[PDB]
Design a protein around this ligand. Sequence first.
Ligand SMILES: [Zn+2]
Lengths: 67, 141, 142, 50, 41, 185, 62
Amino acid sequence: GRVRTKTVKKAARVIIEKYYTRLGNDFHTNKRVCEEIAIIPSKKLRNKIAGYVTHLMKRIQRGPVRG
Amino acid sequence: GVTVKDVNQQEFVRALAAFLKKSGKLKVPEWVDTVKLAKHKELAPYDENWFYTRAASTARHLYLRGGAGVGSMTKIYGGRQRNGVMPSHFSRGSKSVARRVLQALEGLKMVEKDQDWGRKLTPQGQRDLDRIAGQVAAAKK
Amino acid sequence: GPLQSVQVFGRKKTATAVAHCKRGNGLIKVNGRPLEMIEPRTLQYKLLEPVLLLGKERFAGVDIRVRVKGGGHVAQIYAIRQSISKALVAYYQKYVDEASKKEIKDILIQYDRTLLVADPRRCESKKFGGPGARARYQKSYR
Amino acid sequence: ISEASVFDAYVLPKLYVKLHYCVSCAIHSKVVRNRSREARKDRTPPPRFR
Amino acid sequence: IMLPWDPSGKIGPKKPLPDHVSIVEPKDEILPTTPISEQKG
Amino acid sequence: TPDIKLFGKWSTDDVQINDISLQDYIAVKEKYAKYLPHSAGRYAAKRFRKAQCPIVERLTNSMMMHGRNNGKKLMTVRIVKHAFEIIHLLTGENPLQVLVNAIINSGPREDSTRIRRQAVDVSPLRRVNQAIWLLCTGAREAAFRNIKTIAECLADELINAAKGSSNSYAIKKKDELERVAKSNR
Amino acid sequence: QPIKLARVTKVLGRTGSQGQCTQVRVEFMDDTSRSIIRNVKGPVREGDVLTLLESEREARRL
RNA sequence: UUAAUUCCGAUAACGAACGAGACUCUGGCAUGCUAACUAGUUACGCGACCCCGGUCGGCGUAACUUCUUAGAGGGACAAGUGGCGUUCAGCCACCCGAGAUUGAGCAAUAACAGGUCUGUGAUGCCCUUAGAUGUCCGGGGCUGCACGCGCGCUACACUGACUGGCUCAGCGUGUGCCUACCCUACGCCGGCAGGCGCGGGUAACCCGUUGAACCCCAUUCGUGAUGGGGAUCGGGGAUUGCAAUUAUUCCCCAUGAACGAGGAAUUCCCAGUAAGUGCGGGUCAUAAGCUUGCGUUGAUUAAGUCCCUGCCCUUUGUACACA
Ligand SMILES: [Zn+2]
């Protein structure tokens, strides 16, 4: 039951919509970008947000995202 | 050469007990026949010459880990204290029989008393331990 | 030659061991004794499983000193079995070339993982209100 | 019957009994069921699919 | 009585909420369309 | 030597499995060739992880039941090691082949259950587990208030299962359950 | 009346009240055309062989 | 869809929080950083022994963090591949990888004619108020017994019964506040019980480097309500407190029954899990068949469901109304 939460979904779309230019398909690239632009208190929440950002990047590379 | 750690300790204590039976000067009393070993044990030991096995075990324990008194000897002689319907516990061994083993091994010229208690093993007895280790090695080979 | 000192720990459980490697003749010892007086004699071949697969050629130059503390008995057997294996892998890794180390490692990967990688299996703590961790007491009705 | 018979490929009959129930007996046999007030106006039967 | 959050840490604590994520404001910039050199020193 | 592995005194070879159904579940060949069947655990994670456990280790672990036998793996490995010596002196052939033939013979396929009684077939892994449980239960029932030992009773049960003359407990319960399932169908 | 064989090519679901009878589509390895649906107890995966005493039995729809 | 009102989506709904998620302590690994004479490792030299070399928890001092201890951070996220599904939320198999689920705490709204006046100098009312329902001493009772149940412990054996040999843990604990009460090390006396003086510690020092039980190895037994069981009972010997019988507690000998694997019915749990089997803390002038943690060995079955016993919503007649 690894469901990405609403605190991840409200943050990640705003992060991609603002810094859409400085992104990448790799996990270790945007994991350090989110450390710069955002203030995440914990490593587990940071990794969940970064994984959902990479999943949204895979959705972008597949097609258009409605949200 | 060989050493007593390379020698298996199952037959080493029997060979040293045979050597102490060949010696036969280790102060065996007559209450050994009627004594029980400890209160957690039930009956008397089966073999009649069970002083020499304890003497061989005390000799090898003082060779390997010197500086031991009464408690380190009562720790190895222990088992299940089956009281009956109550749940069993652990009980220590007797003190006087180990004290008589220490007195017999002190009367025999193979040990020497150490400061703050304990009976260390003399360099004369280290030669004897190496020679009986060579004897057990020649017996097994 | 120089003292090729390789100290590798082996940890699977509470029983731990430290294997120390060296150059020279081949004499494997665990605190100054070989693997021939092990009680019980049922697990005599268990420590010879890494010995018989590699052969007598690989253990000619390798002599290992092992110190053991804690745990039980079979836990100590698995501890020294993991420790001398990881120390032998480190010995063939650091000094001699990597091709022979890979040729030895390809045997150890296919057989068992316990020789190389330990598993996080420890004792779970007892919970309150039961005889053990999972089991509870009998409920008193009426 | 298809294993042990004298005739070959014997056709089977069917049952034809027209059952009748009242308001209490239909609910006691558990056929009809109380629906929503918007669904009460629908005179349609439940769909015959299987 | 619950104490609110403050940056100074006088009316309340300094550590923010785990659910709250402080996202900074992005910088506004225009991409250069002409390669221009800038020599100084 | 890594070319041949002798399980005590028995190699991996001279093991012929006739049934192709049980050979997929029994995975003692070509992977789990060992000297002693002693291990730590973790063979019950996946649904079909239980089939990857070798049948010698299963015969080792299935003996210890009913409270007082727990923690006697070092006992039962030596018991099975003597049981190979008891089997080989009387049979003459391969005790591994005798055990494979016993597993082939002692398979209860169909069994009825209360859901009328629905007589349906079971899994081949369920047949192997049922055969191991029936042979261990028959050995534990036979070796009680008797001078005859665990290894002797287990050897007699495996020889009677390889013979197949309604003498072994697993063969008898297999024939009884197939008789009941043939009756109520 | 020969003793036939089968093979599991695809699992379908789980029948019964307690959920112990697995609805299994069995493929006959002797005749590779025909296939029936039976309920088989125990852990059943795709690939094993089932020894059928008679092949005329067939489980109905739940 | 999941443990979840956790999200896609349908949209007369949009925008938030509470519970959960989220957050803390612990475990699995980082030979990359800092440290250790109350933790060590490797060697140098001396001493002992065997026949040029090995052994030593026998001793003095040169390097180091490879073991231990712990300040700081990392990684693990469904990230990569293949299948299912609106191809959305997501789900499953696999390679590589210390881990593709460690456990616990906090735990929304609402309520009980649920318990506690016998925890309280938390408390209302009534009574007692001197020959006191207050305070103190010597005993008794709280244990008691035709009967029915509740929570626990050990056996009904050959897988076992007896005797030795061999080989390992981590929780802990401990020199006083009136107050005496602490851990014990070592040489002796004695069959055990117990006793005499004696050194170390305000603790990684002392017990202690916790030789614990099961275990493995070597002797005795052989189907006998039996060597298993010590239920039952008698005599003697010691410690504790001023004082023990109805046995405070411990030791020796003797007595050797019920019990042949258990009927109806019923409780708990699903991987270091049940189970066998021990050890510390609390109760402690004397104190474990109680309770909680810490260890060692180590299985069978299962990766589904509401048929059975409960709990939570729904449509709706409303014999359910400070309900
Ligand atoms: Zn009617």
